[PDB]
């Protein structure tokens, strides 16, 4: 990240590392810069030739992938620098297997995990004539003879916009009757107050749902205010 540092490694793809000092700005190249190509930080990978990252034998998890089992990161391995390493698949383990020994757990734990799944996307519509020509009667007359292309793109976008509401209805509207909870909130000692709806908010959403709606930096996707803010000069 540019907030972290400004040190840069350059990968030349499909090029042997002997050919990279030949491809230096003594003869003219497409990029002007060549100052990386002078130096001892040259490594050869099956992806190509990496310049500016020192190879480190210590295998970590893959931070910035490169190819053929090579990753790179920005670490304090020297005082900060870009390092290149083979990726590590995980901790090595060996099960103590025997034909008369079993291991049976004496305790448990309860883990609540989170899974995020997209359901619908933005419903859009395109004005074909105003996009193609725009306030032009002669261009509209020339566009009219080209065909029914605008009609079939309108048909495709209308089908997509119907399909989004079909997806939302199919995912969420699976319950016949809108059930409601009793006012007593003693569900056997379990605390459900962080996922049950909060009536204090104008929209009856829970704390976690409010956190999700705050964390997703959504665009407008509606809430047009009926053309007034667009018509007003800004």
């Amino acid at each position: 990240g540019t907030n972290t540092s400004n040190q840069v490694a350059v990968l030349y793809q499909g090029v042997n590392c002997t050919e990279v000092p030949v491809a230096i700005h003594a003869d003219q190249l497409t990029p002007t810069w060549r100052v990386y190509s002078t130096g001892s930080n040259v490594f050869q990978t099956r992806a190509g030739c990496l310049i500016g990252a020192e190879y480190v034998n210590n295998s970590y998890e893959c931070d910035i992938p490169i190819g053929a089992g090579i990753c790179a990161s920005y670490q304090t391995q020297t005082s900060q620098s870009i390092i290149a390493y083979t990726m590590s698949l995980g901790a090595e383990n060996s099960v103590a297997y025997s034909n008369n020994s079993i291991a049976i757990p004496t305790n448990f734990t309860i883990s609540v995990t989170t899974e995020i799944l997209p359901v619908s996307m933005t419903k859009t519509s395109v004005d074909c004539t105003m996009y193609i020509c725009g306030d032009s009667t002669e261009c509209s007359n020339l566009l009219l003879q080209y065909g029914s292309f605008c009609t079939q793109l309108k048909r495709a976008l209308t089908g997509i916009a119907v399909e989004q509401d079909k997806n939302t209805q199919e995912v969420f509207a699976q319950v016949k009757q809108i059930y409601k909870t009793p006012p007593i909130k003693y569900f056997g000692g379990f605390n459900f107050s962080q996922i049950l709806p909060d009536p204090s908010k104008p929209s009856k959403r829970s704390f976690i749902e409010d956190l999700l709606f705050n964390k997703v930096t959504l665009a407008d996707a509606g809430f047009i205010k009926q053309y007034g803010d667009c018509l007003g000069d800004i």
Partner: protein, 248 residues
């Protein structure tokens, strides 16, 4: 009792819940608080929905940016082409511009169709997960959370859904010597459910997913065949509950 039947669905008897109910409730509340802290701190968990919004905005901005391209014409300004060129040359440049803009708009429509197909596949997967984990219990491995699935809670999200999968995970283990069956009087006793365990001194029978030793009797074992056939069968006495009540 609902959570007891959830435990009984995954092969753990309900006495475990009825003796560890306060601990399990405390663990559930701690996990809910950990989810609250994780969602308050880290914002990278919602990358799928954020990428949906970014893809729609990027496609619309690209379609807006395609209007300034000339597509080989003398100008991208239609009124300037009108005011400068004659009719036939102007129609040539308008033909080039309409061809370029129509090709860009068809590319946008095709990309939206492919992205809508991907979103529909994800929505069908989400509907299946909701119907089989919120409205019931799942025996499918790793379909709803790593571990043994107990419950699930749906949460709404911008352009998507969020599932909170509750799972049972075994934690603390212990080595035990095991045998497949037991010789009692030449008979081969096999457990009904559970594992024949020992440490070296006495032989007990447990359940698979929790440690709870019980005396090996004829109530929880069944006799099948004799001792000559099973490989690895050890000898041990099997308790008879009827004999002390008969002798009483």
């Amino acid at each position: 009792m609902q959570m007891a039947y959830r435990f009984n669905g995954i092969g753990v008897t309900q006495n475990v819940l009825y003796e560890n109910q306060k601990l399990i409730a405390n663990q559930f509340n701690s996990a809910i608080g950990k989810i609250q802290d994780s969602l308050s701190s880290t914002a990278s968990a919602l990358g799928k929905l954020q990428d949906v919004v970014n893809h729609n905005a990027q496609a619309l901005n690209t379609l807006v940016k395609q209007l300034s391209s000339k597509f080989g014409a003398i100008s991208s300004v239609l009124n300037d082409i009108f005011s400068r060129l004659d009719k036939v040359e102007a129609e040539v440049q308008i033909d080039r511009l309409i061809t370029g803009r129509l090709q860009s708009l068809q590319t946008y429509v095709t990309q939206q169709l492919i992205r809508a197909a991907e979103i529909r596949a994800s929505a069908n997967l989400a509907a299946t997960k909701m119907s089989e984990c919120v409205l019931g219990q799942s025996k499918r491995v790793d379909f709803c959370g790593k571990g043994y699935h107990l419950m699930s809670f749906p949460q709404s999200a911008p352009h998507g859904v969020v599932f909170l999968h509750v799972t049972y995970v075994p934690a603390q283990e212990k080595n035990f010597t095991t045998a497949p069956a037991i010789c009692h009087d030449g008979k081969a006793h096999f457990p009904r459910e559970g594992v024949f365990v020992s440490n070296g001194t006495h032989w007990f029978v447990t359940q698979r997913n929790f440690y709870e030793p019980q005396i090996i009797t004829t109530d929880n074992t069944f006799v099948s065949g004799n001792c000559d056939v099973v490989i690895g069968i050890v000898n041990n006495t099997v308790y008879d509950p009827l004999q002390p009540e008969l002798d009483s």
